[PDB]
Design a protein around this ligand. Structure first.
Ligand SMILES: *[C@@H]1O[C@H](CO)[C@@H](O[C@@H]2O[C@H](CO)[C@@H](O)[C@H](O)[C@H]2NC(C)=O)[C@H](O[C@@H]2O[C@@H](C)[C@@H](O)[C@@H](O)[C@@H]2O)[C@H]1NC(C)=O
Ligand SMILES: *[C@@H]1O[C@H](CO)[C@@H](O[C@@H]2O[C@H](CO)[C@@H](O)[C@H](O)[C@H]2NC(C)=O)[C@H](O[C@@H]2O[C@@H](C)[C@@H](O)[C@@H](O)[C@@H]2O)[C@H]1NC(C)=O
Ligand SMILES: *[C@@H]1O[C@H](CO)[C@@H](O[C@@H]2O[C@H](CO)[C@@H](O)[C@H](O)[C@H]2NC(C)=O)[C@H](O)[C@H]1NC(C)=O
Ligand SMILES: *[C@@H]1O[C@H](CO)[C@@H](O)[C@H](O)[C@H]1NC(C)=O
Length: 257
């Protein structure tokens, strides 16, 4: 009924009990990923998430409350239950608040905050603590390609050698330029027809993505999906647009060697 994984989030760092202490009340933080026991989280059918035999616990259920480790039997029941939405949030059901890394740096302390679907609120429960590196193949079997910081992404004929067709799929639900991992696929607004470009990763809702079961790449805040504009590759414009199920919005990842 239980299984154990790392939890990877902002900038590819992991959820870590600060300094390996199991004392009740010790904050959770970001720290570079590893196998140490204070980064190994056991998910149970009672919706608890445990490390070193203690529970991930909201120290209060307010916006900005700290998340800590605490004895499972003595903590408040409402403070120790968590769900894991398919879009990569980690949510406390009682409060509706979500796990958030307010800064990218190692040693950032994790907080419960209002859900704004930010990349700083995206997490991946996994034993692979390295980003997955893949092509993203879409309309007409062409590949998504980055064309540098501040420019639009667009489709091109796939080629195994193009580094600008290689994407690092990070645990915080960002899609990064593999050769330049400080750069993020970013929608330039939350409205239909806004352009998708590459920008410096900043933890924003504009930089968070979800690969859903219909082949779409969804931006949770806008609700809108990746779309090759007007089904016209020659425009060299990828936008966000409502999900239509059409070929111009279908994508798959293909892992690279
Ligand atoms: C919940 O906590 C959040 C983090 O402190 C608040 O958002 C932050 O508000 C600050 C300004 O007072 C500022 O640091 C940031 O704009 C913002 N941070 C992020 C990433 O959201 C949030 O405050 C609300 O939302 C912000 C955007 C402002 O518009 C405030 O006026 C809002 O109150 C907190 N929510 C509540 C209910 O206070
Ligand atoms: C969580 O807090 C519990 C209540 O304070 C701890 O249980 C107590 O542990 C004592 C030995 O450490 C034991 O003599 C007490 O009778 C017991 N109280 C109860 C109600 O069980 C608990 O410690 C764990 O559970 C006990 C039963 C022993 O197996 C300990 O070795 C366990 O650590 C605390 N949990 C943790 C993980 O610290
Ligand atoms: C994606 O980028 C990564 C990170 O720069 C590349 O991985 C490095 O590859 C070199 C040579 O094989 C290794 O010595 C390093 O250890 C790697 N670094 C890390 C942090 O993993 C990788 O080659 C790129 N391309 C692919 C397809 O993954
Ligand atoms: C596609 O986009 C290109 C570039 O603007 C344009 O020349 C062409 O007419 C567009 N329409 C179609 C149907 O290809």
């Amino acid at each position: 009924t239980s299984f154990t994984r790392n939890i990877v989030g902002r900038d590819g760092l992991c959820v870590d009990v600060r300094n390996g202490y199991d004392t009740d009340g010790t904050p959770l933080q970001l720290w570079p990923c590893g196998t140490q026991r204070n980064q190994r989280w056991t998910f149970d059918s009672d919706d608890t998430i445990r490390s070193m035999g203690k529970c991930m616990t909201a120290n209060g259920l307010n916006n900005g409350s700290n998340i800590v480790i605490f004895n499972c039997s003595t903590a408040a029941e409402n403070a120790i239950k968590w769900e894991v939405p398919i879009d990569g949030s980690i949510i406390n059901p009682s409060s509706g608040l979500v796990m958030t890394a307010p800064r990218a740096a190692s040693r950032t302390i994790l907080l419960l905050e209002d859900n704004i679907y930010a990349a700083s609120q995206g997490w991946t429960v996994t034993n692979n603590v390295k980003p997955i590196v893949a092509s993203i193949v879409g309309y007409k079997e062409m590949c998504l390609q980055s064309n540098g910081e501040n420019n639009g992404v667009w489709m091109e004929d796939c080629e195994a050698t193009s580094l600008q067709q290689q994407w690092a799929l990070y645990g915080d639900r960002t899609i990064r330029v593999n050769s330049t991992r400080g750069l993020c696929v970013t929608t330039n607004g939350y409205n239909s027809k806004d352009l998708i470009i590459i920008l410096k990763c900043q933890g924003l809702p504009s930089q968070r993505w979800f690969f859903n079961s219909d082949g779409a790449i969804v931006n949770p805040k806008s609700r809108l999906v990746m779309d090759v504009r007007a089904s016209n590759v020659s425009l060299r414009e990828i936008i966000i647009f409502p999900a239509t199920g059409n070929p111009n919005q279908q994508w798959v990842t293909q892992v690279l060697p």
